[PDB]
Write a protein that binds this ligand. Structure first.
Ligand SMILES: [K+]
Ligand SMILES: [K+]
Ligand SMILES: [K+]
Ligand SMILES: [K+]
Ligand SMILES: [K+]
Ligand SMILES: [K+]
Ligand SMILES: [Mg+2]
Ligand SMILES: [Mg+2]
Ligand SMILES: [Mg+2]
Ligand SMILES: [Mg+2]
Ligand SMILES: [Mg+2]
Ligand SMILES: [Mg+2]
Ligand SMILES: [Mg+2]
Ligand SMILES: [Mg+2]
Ligand SMILES: [Mg+2]
Ligand SMILES: [Mg+2]
Ligand SMILES: [Mg+2]
Ligand SMILES: [Mg+2]
Ligand SMILES: [Mg+2]
Ligand SMILES: [Mg+2]
Ligand SMILES: [Mg+2]
Ligand SMILES: [Mg+2]
Ligand SMILES: [Mg+2]
Ligand SMILES: [Mg+2]
Ligand SMILES: [Mg+2]
Ligand SMILES: [Mg+2]
Ligand SMILES: [Mg+2]
Ligand SMILES: [Zn+2]
Lengths: 180, 57, 46, 88, 49, 95, 50, 235, 29, 50
RNA sequence: AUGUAUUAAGGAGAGUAUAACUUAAUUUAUGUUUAUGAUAGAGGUUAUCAACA
RNA sequence: UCUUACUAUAGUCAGGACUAUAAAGGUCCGAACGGGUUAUCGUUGCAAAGAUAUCCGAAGAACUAUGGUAAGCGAGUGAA
RNA sequence: GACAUGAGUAACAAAAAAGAGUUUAAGGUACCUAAAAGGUAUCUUAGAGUCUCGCCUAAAGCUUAUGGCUACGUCAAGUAACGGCCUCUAAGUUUAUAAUCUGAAGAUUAUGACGAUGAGAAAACUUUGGUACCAACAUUUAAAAGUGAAAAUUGUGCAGGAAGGAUAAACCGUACCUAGAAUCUGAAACAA
């Protein structure tokens, strides 16, 4: 039992912090490990937290704070405030570590990627249409995407005009007792 | 302006002789028979022929 | 007419003049805080 | 992106943040296959050594969950955030 | 956890040593909280003076 | 300034000697020439026990239904100091 | 509103109707219809008859 | 006035094929120079030890490379070796927490300092011809011409992969007037022995193939003292 | 089924709404 | 100490008075957002009747 | 708005199961009455299907 | 945080010329910079004081920067 | 408060300036084809780039401040190649202490504390008062030569030119914008 560094004297038996291990950047070497730590965390803590809990030796630590956009308390209403910032730490591991590559879009069926992508597009088009209204504009009728209801009325039009089907008065417009 | 322009006089200025004139100088295209403008090239054949001479030659 | 009197203004002179410590540590500044605190203000200073 | 990969030690300390070594996150259908939280009545029969070792099993379990949440969003893996909240 | 492990009783009360290290108590409750109701005899003695 | 001036000033907004900490704690003292000496009596360490062979997990099977202790006839059931001292005698008399 | 819907069968927290018993519809177009309760949403106090 | 070359097949003087465009190998495009046909070129007019070792530093995040004869870099290197690749892409200074040694080249000749000053010359001219006249990456490979001026400048900053392929070329006799040849002219020629020290074992695989006169060693002298451990593929 | 109450649920409930629509199509044939 | 108990009782009351002011405000925001989301279903029924 | 009763230091910041409020942010127990109440099942997150003290 | 005066710590004034000085001048020509002489434009203006040309000072009673002090019964500051 | 009139009018004119190709994503049309699809061409929205031409250029360029309703993966023991924090103090401040004056509030002097726009060891490894002083101006000086600083040397003029202390690596800043082309102040995307 001999740590590579000098250990402190204040013992923490029940730490409540949550450490997140984030994927590195594309061009970063394989000896850098980035983590999300509490704002009160310091370099000395991560070095001691990564060795006593995970048995990971680090030769150096880097830390930087990421701010958060100022916001209103309730969406677009309320006073103007600023959330608590985020602290990220990069450890220079003594042993390299390489992450796995994300699965292919077609191999994400365990996460229900098919349904998730459909929902994402819907929300992607909702925030894009709301941005067109925030500029003081609207989508002209000619650019609206034709829905399934408009694709069905164009096939009926070709069937009536051609002569395949014969038009007849509606029978479900209203349920009258007269039936005339 | 001294007085507000009435509905009668403002309608006189807006529509009396300022109606949109209907274009009547149209004729069909000889290569496809689409409605093109007189003395002008067919836009559907221009782009297609312009793209057809770029592939083969 | 109005003038551009905030051109070149720094945020260190905003804390020294209308900051919070400039009011709790002065007899006349406790009134402002108490006045603004009675009205219900959130931004008591700066 | 076409370099020979390095050999990462099998027993690396940083492998404890991952649920699956191929996909950092766990499938939502297998992420909910868990029990319930310990009741205070059941913990009164555990010594300090058992409650001190169990606390750190929960800490490392939350660090493992926070790691799968951050990856799922960035990698656009899919759903699973609603199941990690109940497990956490 | 298996049923055999959750049912095992391992806690043995003590009287001359605390149940856990005395330092753990500071993590369980805030020593300087204004909501602290369990004080030491020395503190109350100083408060009465 | 119009509105940003009315927000709370942060360290990412000014640089003229405005230092505000994040409550990390004092890990030492400041020197007279601009350096820092780390006092390792204030540095904190995390005590993580050996988890090899530990069988307890953070979940309990739902087949076992949740039940609460009764302590019938005692107001301070779980916090009764009499049932903790009397229980201590039979189980652990020495310590 | 949740109390009004349950008024005839107790209170929202003391419910005297359970999924599995046959009920009769007394409102709407499909009046006097008889089916078996499949689901029982206790949040909006709505019942599903398949 | 400048003249950019075209990505057309050409012959190489090196013993290996540096790129797929290379048609021939080990071709004499000019008679041996004065020092080429010399068994022991020496540090005639340079300080003692100069040219025996050549260091290469790189930005661990953006990939910018710098060559230096001394064990440390200064501000002169950043100005005289980094061309403008866009706004907010040329650092105003050297940050100690971003720049690390990429590799270190050591020649067998303990006093042939003139052989190193030549390798350092071809490496700096190849790096200049990689940021300029990058006709082989415009429509193939990275496809820099299919990228925006912002993204194109970020890919030009990443000279770390190119620099490693420049070492295998220069150390294999690439360039005209390379002093890492040795012509006997009794006329048989060979390559001089060299050693490459790598901070990362995986960084030497950017070159498709290395010559037979280079030996690869892990770790650079002076790195361990800084508590920086080298990266080993085998582990 | 709203557009924002569709991703806040588990896959167990999201798949229970697909069985509803699946068995709803077998009755239309 | 009898004087140390008044300190705790007052602190408990202050924090309990602050949670009621915040809770009351939150209940109205949700109730307003729920009634506006339900109003989308009422408008549909009124449109189909006309 | 007035009257009656009780009471006698007030706010903010950030965070959190977005009815639940303070990093334990839905703690743990007692007693009584439970449809003749109060005013012989299902359900531990598909939760909080119980109120008063 | 404008502006006036004072105050502390700092910074700036291409080049050339004359003069007793290598450096001693509220000296000279003229950029930066600082002024705002005349004219036209503009007048719901680009601007609730701007544009163009022209003109004045430009080693001094000069100009600029970050702080500080003195103001509202009595009047602070004021080459007025 | 809503809605008219002027009026579909003025305006979108810093005397830099544009022209012709190419291309990506999504969507809208027409045809091909009716097995859905896909293909060809075109338009719309949001982009990107190539060749030619011109404008700014002691800028309308680059690097950075003040500042910021632009945006949050911005990474340092120190020097080369960094600031703050920290130590020292100026002009001043003080609901700190003592003494004193004073209708109360307060004021005064001393001390303390605080207070940069200044001063702070070493490193391409490192941890007395002209025996003077570092205001202005001039002169000289890192030896191949020239030039620009730094620091120092010597001298000149009167307007006579600070204070104090010394002497194994925490915490905070680090993104973008610099005003002729999308970010600062001018109510704003303002010819300032
Ligand atoms: K005024
Ligand atoms: K706590
Ligand atoms: K900033
Ligand atoms: K006019
Ligand atoms: K530092
Ligand atoms: K007095
Ligand atoms: Mg930092
Ligand atoms: Mg100003
Ligand atoms: Mg308590
Ligand atoms: Mg300071
Ligand atoms: Mg930058
Ligand atoms: Mg001022
Ligand atoms: Mg003069
Ligand atoms: Mg002049
Ligand atoms: Mg004037
Ligand atoms: Mg005038
Ligand atoms: Mg004159
Ligand atoms: Mg008119
Ligand atoms: Mg007109
Ligand atoms: Mg006009
Ligand atoms: Mg299309
Ligand atoms: Mg700034
Ligand atoms: Mg001090
Ligand atoms: Mg300073
Ligand atoms: Mg402008
Ligand atoms: Mg300008
Ligand atoms: Mg503006
Ligand atoms: Zn045609």
């Amino acid at each position: 039992r001999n740590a590579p560094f000098r250990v402190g004297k204040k013992q923490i038996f029940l730490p409540n912090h949550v450490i997140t291990f984030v994927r590195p950047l594309p061009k970063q070497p394989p000896n850098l490990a980035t983590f999300i730590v509490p704002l009160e965390f310091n370099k000395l803590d991560l070095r001691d937290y990564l060795y006593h809990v995970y048995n990971v030796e680090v030769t150096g630590v880097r830390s930087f704070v990421n701010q958060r956009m100022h916001e209103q308390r309730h969406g677009d209403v309320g006073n103007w405030r600023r959330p608590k910032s985020q602290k990220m730490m990069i450890a220079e591991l003594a042993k390299p570590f390489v992450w796995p590559k994300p699965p292919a879009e077609d191999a994400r069926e365990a996460f229900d990627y098919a349904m998730w992508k459909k929902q994402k597009t819907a929300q992607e088009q909702d925030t894009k249409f709301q941005g067109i209204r925030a500029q003081g504009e609207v989508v002209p009728p000619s650019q609206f995407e034709v829905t399934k209801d408009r694709k069905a009325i164009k096939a009926r039009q070709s069937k009536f005009l051609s002569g395949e089907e014969t038009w007849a008065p509606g029978k479900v417009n209203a349920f009258l007792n007269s039936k005339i | 302006p001294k007085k507000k322009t009435s509905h009668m006089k403002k309608r006189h200025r807006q529509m009396a002789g300022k109606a949109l004139k209907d274009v009547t100088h149209l004729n069909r295209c000889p290569a496809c028979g689409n409605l093109k403008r007189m003395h002008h090239l067919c836009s559907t054949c221009l782009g297609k022929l312009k793209g057809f001479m770029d592939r083969n030659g | 007419g109005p003038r551009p009197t905030m051109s070149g203004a720094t945020r260190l002179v905003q804390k020294r003049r209308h900051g919070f410590l400039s009011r709790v540590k002065t007899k006349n500044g406790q009134k402002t805080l108490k006045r603004r605190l009675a009205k219900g203000r959130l931004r008591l200073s700066a | 992106e076409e370099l020979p990969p390095i050999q990462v030690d099998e027993n690396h300390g940083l492998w404890d943040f991952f649920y699956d070594r191929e996909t950092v996150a766990m499938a939502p259908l297998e992420h909910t296959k868990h029990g319930r939280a310990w009741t205070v009545s059941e913990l009164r029969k555990k010594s300090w050594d058992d409650l001190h070792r169990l606390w750190w099993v929960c800490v490392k379990e939350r660090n493992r969950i926070a790691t799968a949440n951050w990856e799922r969003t960035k990698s656009e893996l899919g759903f699973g955030l609603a199941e990690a909240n109940e497990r956490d | 956890t298996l049923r055999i492990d959750v049912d095992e009783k391992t806690f043995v009360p003590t009287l001359f040593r605390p149940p856990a290290p005395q330092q753990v108590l500071d993590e369980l409750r805030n020593k300087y909280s204004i909501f602290r109701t369990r004080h030491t005899p020395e503190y109350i003695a100083k408060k009465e003076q | 300034g119009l509105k940003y001036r009315k927000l709370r000033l942060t360290t990412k907004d000014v640089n003229k000697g405005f230092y505000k900490g994040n409550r990390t704690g004092s890990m030492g003292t400041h020197t007279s020439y601009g350096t820092y000496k780390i006092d390792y009596t204030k540095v904190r360490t995390y005590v993580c026990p050996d988890l090899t062979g530990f069988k307890l997990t953070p979940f309990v099977s739902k087949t076992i239904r949740p039940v609460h202790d009764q302590f019938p006839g005692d107001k301070l059931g779980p916090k009764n100091p009499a049932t903790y001292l009397a229980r201590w005698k039979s189980e652990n008399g020495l310590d | 509103e949740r109390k009004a819907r349950v008024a005839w069968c107790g209170s929202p927290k003391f419910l005297c109707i359970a999924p599995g018993d046959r009920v009769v519809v007394i409102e709407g177009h499909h009046k006097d219809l008889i089916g078996t309760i499949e689901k029982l949403n206790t949040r909006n106090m709505t019942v599903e008859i398949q | 006035s400048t003249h950019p070359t075209t990505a057309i097949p050409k012959p190489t003087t090196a013993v290996l094929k540096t790129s797929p465009l290379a048609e021939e190998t080990a071709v004499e495009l000019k008679s041996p120079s004065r020092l080429q046909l010399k068994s022991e070129p020496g540090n005639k007019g340079n300080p003692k030890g100069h040219g025996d070792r050549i260091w290469a530093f790189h930005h661990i995040e953006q990939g910018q490379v710098i060559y230096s004869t001394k064990p440390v870099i200064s501000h002169q290197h950043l100005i005289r070796q980094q061309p403008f690749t866009g706004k907010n892409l040329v650092p105003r200074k050297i940050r100690k927490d971003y720049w690390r040694p990429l590799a270190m080249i050591e020649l067998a000749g303990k006093d042939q300092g003139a052989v190193g000053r030549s390798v350092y010359q071809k490496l700096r001219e190849f790096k200049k011809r990689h940021e300029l006249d990058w006709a082989n990456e415009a429509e193939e490979g990275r496809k820099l011409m299919h990228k925006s001026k912002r993204e194109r400048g970020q890919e030009l900053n990443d000279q770390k992969p190119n620099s490693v392929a420049d070492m295998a070329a220069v150390l294999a006799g690439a360039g005209k007037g390379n002093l890492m040849w040795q012509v006997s002219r009794l006329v048989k020629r060979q390559l001089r022995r060299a050693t490459v020290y790598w901070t990362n074992e995986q960084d030497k695989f950017h070159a498709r193939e290395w010559s037979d006169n280079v030996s690869h060693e892990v770790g650079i002298p002076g790195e361990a003292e800084k508590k920086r451990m080298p990266i080993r593929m085998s582990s | 089924w709203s557009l924002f109450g569709w991703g806040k649920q588990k896959v167990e409930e999201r798949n229970k709404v697909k069985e509803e629509l699946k068995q709803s199509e077998l009755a239309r044939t | 100490m009898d004087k140390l108990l008044r300190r705790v009782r007052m602190a408990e009351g202050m924090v309990a008075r602050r949670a009621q002011r915040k809770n009351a405000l939150l209940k109205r925001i949700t109730e307003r957002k729920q009634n506006k989301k339900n109003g989308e279903a009422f408008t549909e029924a009124i449109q189909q009747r006309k």
